[PDB]
Amino acid sequence: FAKLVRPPVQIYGIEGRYATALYSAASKQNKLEQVEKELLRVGQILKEPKMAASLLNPYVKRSVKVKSLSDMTAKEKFSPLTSNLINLLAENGRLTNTPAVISAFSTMMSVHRGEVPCTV
Amino acid sequence: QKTGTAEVSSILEERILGADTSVDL
């Protein structure tokens, strides 16, 4: 009981593999923008102060949230790489640290372009 | 507690494409 430390938090492993295991196919189809830009919307939807209460409210439940997620993506017009990983985020109660998983996507995307020469 | 995951997003990619194997069991 004397001093206190506060380390930052970003990129870890199972959360980073969620974006790299879904965008790994996007890297071959050139969807890093289709998956990195749509995933950011999930972080803003939970970061929003009016929407943050709806995602953390105890009434959304889990089975009901699965239908609300698919019924929201239908109006959000997500991309071909954002209507599957979205369920995993709301499948096992993963809407608390969901923005940290999107940040790892930007760091993993840098490793998909560094080893891919495509300029003339 | 609420835990128990095994790279589910990785196995899901194989179901949609599954085009990368190198003798691994």
Side-chain angles (χ1 to χ4, degrees):
Chain A
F1 213 120
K3 274 187 191 163
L4 215 156
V5 181
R6 290 184 155 248
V9 298
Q10 229 147 42
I11 299 87
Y12 316 81
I14 182 62
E15 271 201 315
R17 278 275 137 74
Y18 269 45
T20 18
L22 180 100
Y23 115 69
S24 33
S27 190
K28 202 202 189 155
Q29 300 202 27
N30 211 73
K31 262 65 187 217
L32 271 288
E33 206 94 89
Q34 296 221 235
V35 207
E36 196 269 314
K37 216 80 89 155
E38 274 66 282
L39 260 65
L40 274 171
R41 288 272 162 80
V42 177
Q44 212 152 48
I45 293 160
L46 181 62
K47 280 171 89 210
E48 269 285 313
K50 215 155 157 262
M51 184 67 171
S54 282
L55 273 150
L56 180 150
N57 219 27
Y59 295 85
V60 178
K61 222 145 274 217
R62 207 272 268 108
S63 294
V64 180
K65 199 184 264 179
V66 179
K67 191 213 184 273
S68 291
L69 219 69
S70 192
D71 194 274
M72 191 190 82
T73 278
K75 185 93 199 88
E76 200 151 306
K77 261 209 210 284
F78 259 123
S79 244
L81 274 298
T82 332
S83 300
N84 266 96
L85 175 65
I86 187 150
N87 276 274
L88 264 142
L89 267 174
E91 181 186 304
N92 286 23
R94 221 149 279 252
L95 273 161
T96 60
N97 299 284
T98 189
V101 181
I102 298 152
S103 298
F105 193 112
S106 293
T107 304
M108 296 294 190
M109 181 268 208
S110 214
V111 183
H112 104 298
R113 216 154 97 120
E115 298 146 69
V116 180
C118 59
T119 319
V120 180
Chain B
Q1 268 210 56
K2 277 197 287 147
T3 320
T5 318
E7 265 163 80
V8 179
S9 174
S10 174
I11 183 160
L12 202 79
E13 184 215 71
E14 185 178 45
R15 184 181 266 75
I16 186 171
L17 283 165
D20 270 274
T21 38
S22 70
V23 180
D24 204 68
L25 208 153

